[PDB]
Curated annotation (Swiss-Prot), chain A:
Modification comment: Acetylated on Lys-22 and Lys-23 in the presence of glucose. PatZ controls acetylation of Lys-23 but not of Lys-22.
Modified residues (N6-acetyllysine): 22-23
The protein, known as: DNA-directed RNA polymerase subunit alpha
Residues covered by region (Alpha C-terminal domain (alpha-CTD)): 1-50
Stated role: DNA-dependent RNA polymerase (RNAP) catalyzes the transcription of DNA into RNA using the four ribonucleoside triphosphates as substrates. This subunit plays an important role in subunit assembly since its dimerization is the first step in the sequential assembly of subunits to form the holoenzyme. Part of the processive rRNA transcription and antitermination complex (rrnTAC). The complex forms an RNA-chaperone ring around the RNA exit tunnel of RNAP. It supports rapid transcription and antitermination of rRNA operons, cotranscriptional rRNA folding, and annealing of distal rRNA regions to allow correct ribosome biogenesis.
From Swiss-Prot, chain B:
Applied biotechnology uses: Co-administration of salinamide and rifampicin or salinamide and myxopyronin suppresses the emergence of resistance to both antibiotics.
Family: Belongs to the RNA polymerase beta' chain family.
Origin: domain of life: Bacteria
Lineage: Bacteria, Pseudomonadati, Pseudomonadota, Gammaproteobacteria, Enterobacterales
Modification comment: Acetylated on several lysine residues in the presence of glucose.
Name of protein: DNA-directed RNA polymerase subunit beta'
Subunit structure: The RNAP catalytic core consists of 2 alpha, 1 beta, 1 beta' and 1 omega subunit. When a sigma factor is associated with the core the holoenzyme is formed, which can initiate transcription. The rRNA transcription and antitermination complex (rrnTAC) consists of RNAP, NusA, NusB, NusE (rpsJ), NusG, SubB, ribosomal protein S4, DNA and precursor rRNA; S4 is more flexible than other subunits.
Species this protein is from: Escherichia coli (strain K12)
Function: DNA-dependent RNA polymerase (RNAP) catalyzes the transcription of DNA into RNA using the four ribonucleoside triphosphates as substrates. Resistance to the antibiotics salinamide A, salinamide B, rifampicin, streptolydigin, CBR703, myxopyronin, and lipiarmycin can result from mutations in this protein.
Swiss-Prot record, chain C:
The keyword Transferase appears for this protein: yes
GO molecular function, one term: DNA-binding transcription activator activity
Motif (RPON box): 349-357
Protein name: RNA polymerase sigma-54 factor
Record's GO cellular component terms: cytosolic DNA-directed RNA polymerase complex; protein-DNA complex
Function: Sigma factors are initiation factors that promote the attachment of RNA polymerase to specific initiation sites and are then released. This sigma factor is responsible for the expression of enzymes involved in arginine catabolism. The open complex (sigma-54 and core RNA polymerase) serves as the receptor for the receipt of the melting signal from the remotely bound activator protein GlnG(NtrC).
UniProt KW keywords: Arginine metabolism, DNA-binding, DNA-directed RNA polymerase, Nucleotidyltransferase, Sigma factor, Transcription, Transcription regulation, Transferase
GO biological process per UniProt: arginine metabolic process; cell motility; DNA-templated transcription initiation; nitrate assimilation; positive regulation of DNA-templated transcription; regulation of DNA-templated transcription; regulation of DNA-templated transcription initiation; submerged biofilm formation
This protein's encoding gene: rpoN
Origin organism lineage: Bacteria, Pseudomonadati, Pseudomonadota, Gammaproteobacteria, Enterobacterales
Length: 50, 51, 369
């Protein structure tokens, strides 16, 4: 749902998931990179009581 | 070196400016871990400002 | 007597150099723009392919922070055929947000848009400046403000605020990382006016300590001793001839330099042309006008209707003077310039005047109004 949840997902997990090809993963990485973010980050004590 | 009479045998007294300089990558890692900084440059700026 | 300095910078050293043995020179490391960029690349959660693409991308960044090859070059340089171009674009987008923001941009419009993408949405004149940069960035370069106003459909004040916001950005983001220190030059021959005429003298910064090690071998160095003397003699003679022939350049600046060549000095000093070409290269003289390389005084010429010759540097200076005082409402075309220099006796062409204008980096007539 949130950017915080997506950012923690790694590239391999989002490659193995069904209905998500290489183009969609690349577009996700592109829209993340537009804001200086990347997949594979790690966060502690998430979510903060949404 | 000065003297500290209140210390225990396993303890020393370290200035916090020296500690801030010596433990810098640990501070970067802990800052990025808990969401305060999203990138390395943000943590660099935060440590520079001494927030 | 040689002039004694009435002021100076006190020497940095404040020690007594007591130790009689000091180690050999090793040097230090420096952090350039690319070192900082790679340091940021390593600490980023990339992949193996992403890190290779980032390495190839950072290899192509220049001193100003602008990408110097098209993305197709990088994709070819990767060397793997499964990789498409969108992955390269994504890695480039991620790199462009490293410190300083806007680095590794394709062109100015891209860099300005990247910098504007980082400001918070509550900045007042954000959409207007974004539209100006994205759509019409050359109308701003022409300082038009009316056709741009006719297209952007905006009033005066909004346009002024948007222009002020645009001009507050950084066009060269990569110059922030200053690894360089301004280096200088040491003049070798100094020219000063004595008895109303200009005379030259060697700089006394060299090492004239003529010594030998008679304690113990020095026969070979005895030849180098007089080799240095020969070098000093030839440099002094060539510089003296150059200054004697150019007595009017120093007095009145440019527009009076004579059209001399290597052969003239070779005949004057009785040496081969090659020796003159070797001495007068990467050697400088200091005058109350500035520091000039000895090669600066050799120039071409054009025919003068009066029967003489006019140096090309004089014609360049005249072109500069004429253009600097042209009509602000309607500037001067090179056809006008060739006419004005024609009446003075300077018989030059028109394309030659255009070449001179290009070398001086002066925009054409239409761009000077």
């Amino acid at each position: 749902h949130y950017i915080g949840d997506l950012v923690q997902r790694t590239e391999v997990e989002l490659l193995k998931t069904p209905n998500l090809g290489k183009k969609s993963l690349t577009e996700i990485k592109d829209v993340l990179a537009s804001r200086g973010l990347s997949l594979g980050m790690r966060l502690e004590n998430w979510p903060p009581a949404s | 070196i000065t003297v500290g009479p209140y210390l225990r045998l396993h303890q020393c007294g370290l200035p916090k400016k020296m500690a801030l300089e010596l433990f810098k990558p640990f501070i970067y890692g802990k800052l990025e871990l808990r969401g305060l900084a999203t990138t390395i440059k943000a943590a660099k700026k935060m440590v520079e400002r001494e927030e | 007597w040689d002039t004694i300095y009435t002021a100076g910078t006190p020497s940095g050293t404040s020690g007594d150099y007591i130790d009689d043995e000091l180690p050999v020179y090793q040097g230090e490391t420096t952090q350039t723009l690319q070192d900082y960029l790679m340091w940021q690349v390593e600490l980023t959660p990339f992949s193996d392919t992403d890190r290779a693409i980032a390495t190839s991308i950072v290899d192509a960044v220049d001193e100003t922070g602008y990408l110097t090859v098209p993305l197709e070059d990088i994709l070819e340089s990767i060397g793997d055929e499964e990789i498409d171009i969108d992955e390269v674009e994504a890695v480039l987008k991620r790199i462009q947000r490293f410190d300083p923001v806007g680095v590794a941009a394709k062109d100015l419009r891209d860099c300005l848009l990247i910098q504007l993408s980082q400001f918070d949405k509550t900045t007042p004149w954000l959409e207007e400046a974004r539209l100006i940069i994205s759509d019409h960035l050359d109308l701003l370069a022409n300082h038009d403000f009316r056709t741009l106003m006719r297209v952007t459909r905006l009033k005066e004040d909004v346009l002024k605020e948007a222009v002020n916001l645009i001009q507050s950005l950084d066009p060269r983001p990569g110059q922030s990382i200053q690894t360089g220190e301004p280096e200088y030059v040491i003049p070798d021959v100094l020219v000063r006016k004595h008895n109303g005429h200009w005379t030259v003298e060697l700089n006394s910064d060299s090492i004239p300590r003529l010594q030998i090690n008679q304690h113990y071998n020095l026969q070979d160095a005895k030849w180098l001793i007089k080799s240095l003397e020969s070098r000093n003699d030839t440099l002094l003679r060539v510089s003296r001839c150059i200054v004697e022939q150019q007595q009017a350049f120093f007095e009145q600046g440019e527009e009076y330099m004579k059209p001399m060549v290597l052969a003239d000095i070779a005949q004057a000093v009785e040496m081969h042309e090659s020796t003159i070409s070797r001495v007068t290269t990467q050697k400088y003289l200091h005058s109350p006008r500035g520091i000039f390389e000895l090669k600066y005084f050799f120039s071409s010429h054009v025919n003068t209707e009066g029967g003489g010759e006019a140096s090309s540097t004089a014609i360049r200076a005249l072109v500069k003077k004429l253009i600097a005082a042209e009509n602000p409402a309607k500037p001067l075309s090179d056809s006008k310039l060739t006419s004005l220099l024609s009446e003075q006796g300077i018989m030059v062409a028109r394309r030659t005047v255009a070449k001179y204008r290009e070398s001086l980096s002066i925009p054409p007539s239409n761009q000077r109004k």
